[PDB]
């Protein structure tokens with residue numbers, strides 16, 4: 001049983017993007033509570049090779065635990081298995097890699113979150129209208145599950161049609177371009193889903209322009225996460241609903257379960273559904289993460 005101060009854990013986001021600041025906060029809080037050494041290790045891009053290199057270094061340093069949010073699941077399966085054969089405890093959070101041999105996944109039930117968005121939209125549109133889906137990186141499991149949940153849920157509504165599903169790699173400028181093109185192609189668009197953190201900010205940015213201002217109030221917009229721009233969009237009426245995950249709680253649990261596994265008292269890991277809050281203007285101050 002390692003002395004807490006000799007315990008070393010590392011937490012890896014998909015990249016330095018806004019959502020993961022909360023995961024860092026929650027992990028750092030839990031590590032400090034636990035008295036262990038903690039590092040936040042950030043990829044430079046979303047590709048995959050970049051996260052393999054990080055795990056090899058961590059192997060090299062005989063660190064005790066690794067928690068990772070995975071950009072693309074297949075890429076990282078091989079190096080995560082070696083880490084485990086070196087005694088390193090490994091788990092995922094936010095975005096899973098199910099065949100990496102990781103002990104457990106901590107995060108949202110992403111297909112169910114999509115399903116919930118679909119019900120919200122279907123009710124809001126009275127089962128009628130063209131809709132578009134804006135995603136981030138096309139290889140992301142959690143994002144693709146969200147999309148699958150939306151499409152399966154919308155199948156209940158014959159009068160709704162998904163006319164567009166497009167990615168952005170969560171580049172805001174790319175998101176703006178995509179949203180601009182969508183609105184031009186579909187003047188009778190009735191709804192938009194943003195299943196990654198950029199979708200809300202991009203839709204609000206585009207709707208708040210001279211060219212598209214008249215679309216304000218015409219569309220039902222549902223977005224993911226609670227980035228300040230998204231909250232401002234919800235405040236301003238450009239966004240009608242969001243889905244808020246529990247990123248702080250993910251980071252906290254990630255460290256706590258790493259420590260428990262490292263110290264040999266995690267009897268049989270099990271996935272944790274950290275849950276997701278449907279947030280509108282009416283409850284936007286009282287949700288937690």
Ligand SMILES: O[C@H]1[C@H](O)[C@@H](O)OC[C@H]1O
Nearest residue numbers: 019094095196197224225
């Ligand atoms: O919605 C979140 C997602 O859970 C995470 O994986 O990437 C950042 C945001 O897109």
Ligand SMILES: [Cl-]
Nearest residue numbers: 172197198201
């Ligand atoms: Cl953004």
